[model samples]
Target: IEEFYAQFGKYILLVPGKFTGTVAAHDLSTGRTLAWLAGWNYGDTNPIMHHMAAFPSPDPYKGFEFIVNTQGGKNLFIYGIPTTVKEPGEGFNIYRVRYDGTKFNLVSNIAEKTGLGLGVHVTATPDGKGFAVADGQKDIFAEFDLATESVRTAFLVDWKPNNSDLKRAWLEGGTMTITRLKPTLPGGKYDYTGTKGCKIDWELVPGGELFLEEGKVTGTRQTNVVALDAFVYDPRGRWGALSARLPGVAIIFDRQDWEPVVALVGAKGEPSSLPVKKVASDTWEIKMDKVVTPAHQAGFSPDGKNFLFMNGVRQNNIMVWDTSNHADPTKWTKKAVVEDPGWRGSYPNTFHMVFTPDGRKVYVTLWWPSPTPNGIAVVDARNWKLLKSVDIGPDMHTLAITYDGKYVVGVFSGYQKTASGIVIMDTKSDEVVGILPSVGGHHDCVIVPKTVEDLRCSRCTTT
Candidate 1:
């Protein structure tokens, strides 16, 4: 059924159940359920299951493009693409008839044929021209050309699945594993691996632009492969700065495959930066005096003179360092330290932080207490002080701010029973304007606006 777009403004889609191929659309403005579109019966007594609903096309014409798994479990059905058109009769005779399902019409089927199935996640670039689909089972990533209708596997992640009982024991010990996808070539492809597998949480530095933090792993068992807690890529998309938790050191890599330039090490509260030989395969030297804070997430600032790191443990603050001269990171004093008074009792739990387009404001989300009402906190970037707090109600997991920094969207849940939903907040007013029901144990969200021209690699140039 068609409804007036004026009341809803933008229709929000929801996935309620996994095995039940039911899709719900809601009018956010009035919080009314508009349509509960059911999947094809597939000549079965039971309904087909729908996993993901991704907008692969440049624009939403018939409706949002989605993929549904058939009741037989081997085939997939794709809908929302107009199959017929007619001349105007009684009204705008755009009423269409359903087309026979074809396996070639499905994107997931194409990936599955290429040995990429697990159906981890799908995302469109900010501009919407290029979209990416990930395979969790194969640990593979594929990039799709929506305009050309071409699909190619980009990167094969270096994942050596650890089958150690110790690792499984760590999982039972309440540690959460965080798998990170590092884009090797800017907007090209990414290598995926569990960064601090069996850890508590992680934070992205420089607002998901530069590095990331894998929170502390308390009960330790030694291994040669140290989980790279944080990483930084050069302008050319080469792995540059790699940091680890135990050693409390930062290593600079010149190329994707290279020995580190410098290795600075210390115990937990004392962090140091070291100098390196500019050549390849040189032994790393530690510069003792250039000490800085033990950082979870780090990166060079916009000016390229200083470094920015999110201190996940020490003070729940983002530490900026003057790394202009590498000989002295002690000259690398803290430039800005953002902390929220409302979260004073909950320090060190601030998990996610993102900077505004102008780099003037920082948005942070906190975890812990399971059902904290205020899930988001805002900070002024200049002075590093708390600006405001937005209470996002209960079960808020994570949040994503729009490119313009005008809107903030988050995922919330009451665990398995309720499945959770999305909350859209106005950044300026710090008010939650709309709630859209979501599914699949909602983890994170990336917003792609309709105004973008080149969704694929447009934002990758500067990043």
Candidate 2:
């Protein structure tokens, strides 16, 4: 099979697409075609991808480090109503490429001397130095010190509560309850409170119990909390899964450390900044009595015990949580909300999801009530059934999986953005295998170390 799949290397699949602001790298076991960035200078003569994110490395690997994002600021509009005017592509350049030799080869970027934003969502930080990005133009998360590359201080992640600001606003319930009528803060907001915090930061994890002024008195009750969308840690980064759209709620904490210093820990005069972790607030929540929008693409089960949630807002129902007690998730429950031939999903979106590192199986990408199907389903995480849908394009949004987890690339973008591409799959032959046209079909991707000698792309050396 071509020298046993070229010795198990060359797995790249970058793709940032967004109307061809561009970031394409493809070659997941050989569909091949390494460069299409147009001409990487990134100061934007016309540059535009704005958040493609990646970070892969070593052994059956060999190379990876992506992060692209090009454009920013059409002039601040975070409708959460607060005004400070610190938003734009201010010098906002984003670069980091590696694969070299077949294409893609910058190796490090950003820091055209400070001031940047609009990265949308860049990931690649498990303490590998640099990238946690996320400034979808406003309420920043910026975590870069890249070998004197600059930014300073680090803890990662960003937030917004009564301090609420940034607003690309997808907002709708399952709980980040957000009442923002204003009035809580010694001021300064953003990080820690986000990094996926809520459900009272997993009731303050670590064999846990919600203490910390008990979320300063029941944490803004729209019925106590949950609304997080970008948290999936576990390949031993140590457990973290979130899906709170609202089948009552879902959570599974720890293994999130995205610091950048700043900690008001929200409450004094209620100064809100949410991240104070070294681990062990010990979380494991899930309420579901049958409220399907309780998830929005969830993962974790490469031995993190188990997880799977994908319903969020549009709702079609796929919830499976199995933990013989991965340390008490309220004693964990619900092993199936989807059994027979399921998944019909409606309204907002399935949003896209993953799981398949011997967690049995799960590869999702669902969309509203349609012609007998939407696209990408394949389940069976041991009895949650549903087993196979694979349409490739009813309209997926974005997703990337590959690091010895079998493969998936999905990103569609048409009917709304008007046509962008990327769809490669193979969760044990549920198959699609290759579909790249590439141009703004995505967000943050990672797997790094195509060559950094076991990793150390480090930059920003104080100042």
Candidate 3:
């Protein structure tokens, strides 16, 4: 066999085993190999062979650590070692080697506890002292303390279920009125226009404190004539906003499911009302009457100060609202709007939006726009000005960025198929750098940081 070692200064070690020869190491920076030593089988029945090698540890603390998810065996593998060397024909196992500047040592082979096999997305906290991992299947999040090497369950958000009668009602073609929990008593039968006079479907839009019951609405209820696509959360994760494509509209569910306190209406003709009212408790509501017929997705600003609404179907521009003064939404000004030249079809609207690490830039991914290159359009977060658009290839659905703000990773296909691998991008240079092959229908990714605690040995026995 062959072995490699790392040293703080220039030093080399050679180790050989049966069926292989000894190899020498050189300065890693220079990319040069040192020497090759021939070896013979030694000892006993059949034949026995052994090789020995040693190298100095570069630093006393830093070592190699990795995590792996396996199928039949344990799910996670965390290894800590001074240095790791690659053997020939070992495939992905080559990453197991640890190399210190001077010397190296094998430290640990700890395994992570296995739970539901659902894919996990990981993100580091702003300070980089802790990390959060989300189990999408279980709808739970876990926070890990790097400083203490401890983990705790942080939050659990579950999906609401359809009411039994409502599910059966859908089967008959007649609609059932499922009322969401109303935040406030109706103000002497308030007038509800534009929305077809249908009883509120509480089972359709459920909003709750920590977890949403399948059909209960914790906030204002908005009517969706068609199918509901997605329910997005505001920056604080307090409000659940539902979006419908056909009659493009964004409805804000209040903490209590009452009449929708705030509504962003969208349609073909001229824009209409921007109503603001005080609901129950400390919450206030604002309804923008202008019809953004067939709007896709809506989200709040990073500061939770304003709202951004996008048009669905063949619509172009995205509308912005200045909600700094929640009491007087009429004072809200349309700060900025953006239109993509590639917009054409109505099927796949701009479905996703994300802000940059510094919150200085906003990125939007486009879909169903023929002849338009599928990729990301970068906008100035402050003014919504079009900065540049990077082409990411066909069927680019979603993306995630690294913590250091260097890479943008995403899947090239839709979420249903498992054939696509994770595509990586060099954000600085705006180029596709690497593609992680065969990740199996990956949905999302988040980058974490390497900290002082991440360098600690998980299996150390210090007193």
Candidate 4:
């Protein structure tokens, strides 16, 4: 333990306790808690810190001085309902905390009413000037700019037909409908969209389909929408990718204009961005050649030459794309599809992934329903093959790699009785070296980079 601390004392691991509702900063070497931030005392309500991001300070030596966390709001579960419950809206805030060489302090906060519903994951841009937030339940892609300290809606999944009685949303070229449910009790219900009496159904709309737009697009409404699981940008800030879990699609955008780009080949052997047609004054239709389902997270290699999109839920494979041709989106081709070798469920599923500093290997977290053990899968980046699977722990959702590319840290976010804490793996031997049982039930985490070259910590955005 002494020798380990001597080698890794400079790095600090930042973890947002999902169950504990506290953002913990730990000295990575000794597992010492440096500071715990529960956000500002808003007097209205408390915040449940879910995911967090840290950016480097201009001082160069401070190393990730600014920390921002999403309070996650009141929407606890991410399954079943398309959006937050209508009655009791998500009433939380996004907090931006600063580390002033001693402790973490609240700097600012963004309310959930700012079109941010159930904020899930946040990743800082490589330049450290902006951050992209994944509003999971709301299905809205938002951006926070440091230059003006403002938040703006970048993308969203808007369902059409704008009706009150029969609520409809887009679901994989189908229309998902949610009819009104009578009050189960005399006093009504706690959550409007709870599974007590609500009957949600889906059917393929023969001609009524909606997809990620390419050219001119407009959403009539932003409420009751699909789910955007995660959003990430490449290290060079050249491209951005988002995972739309419900629609089972991956939308790639260029950072220059923030417009959708087509990396997949069209049906006519031509490049297409899946253009959208305005059918009526407020209604828009999408044209897609193929559909990729149930995505969890989008990741990019350290060199920004390759991109990986995880197809979870039913499909247990990952699509690797060669994103080197930034100028021509048509030139980008699917490099390989890595599949899960061992899984004990209806279908294999994956959550988040992180690439080694050298970008030679990738580590992905394996997921399953309850009563099952979770693990991590190692993939050969060069050859694009599933090399091995190691049972790290249960419900390992997030990952953070070391700056020196020697170690990778896995966070167990699930609430399993026998599960351990954070698991560490050595890159050289591809084995679990130790388990830090102190960090408990953390959904997401980031490591404060120790050196300038440490920016290669791709998935965690440890700049």
lDDT of 4 by residue, 1-463 (tens): 8776665545677887654556777777776777877543444233446677777644322434544444332333332234444433233456677666667777665432233333556777777667777654445556667655655335544433233322223222443221211223333321222111111111111011222221111233332344555567767666666665544555666667555554332111223234434454323344433343445566778877887776654466777778787566556667777865554243447667888888899988886655577888899999999898888666677788877787888787555233548788888889988887754567777777544345546433321
Query: What are the RMSDs of all candidates, in order?
Result: 12.9, 20.2, 17.8, 9.1
Could you estimate the TM-score for every candidate? 0.49, 0.28, 0.44, 0.76
Candidate 1 C-alpha lDDT tens digits along 1-463 = 1332243344333333323434444444356554454433322222333223233333332344433322221112111223242321111000011112211122233322322222333444333444444332232344455554344323322212233343332112121122223344334323222221212121121112112122222223322122343233322232234444322344554333343444433222444444543322222333233222233444443223444455444334555544555443334444545655544442434544445555566566654434445367776766767777766655444454454556656665443334367777676777767666565333333332334421211111111
The Cα local distance difference test for each model comes to 0.38, 0.42, 0.35, 0.56
TM-score head-to-head 2 vs 4, winner: 4
Please report how far candidate 4 places residue 186 from its true position, in Å. 39
lDDT winner between 2 and 3, please give it.
2
Identify the runs in model 2 with alpha carbons over 4 angstroms from their true place: 1-11, 14-65, 68-95, 98-377, 380-385, 388-428, 431-463
Ranking of candidates on lDDT, top first: 4, 2, 1, 3
Best by lDDT: 4
Give stretches of model 1 more than 4 Å off. 1-308, 313-315, 321-334, 341-348, 415-419, 449-463
**lDDT for position 295 in model 4:** 53
The parts of candidate 4 lying over 4 Å away from their true place are 39-46, 58-63, 71-74, 77-89, 112-118, 159-224, 263-285, 289-292, 343-347, 416-420, 450-456, 459-463
Best by TM-score: 4
Clashes of each: 5, 61, 43, 3
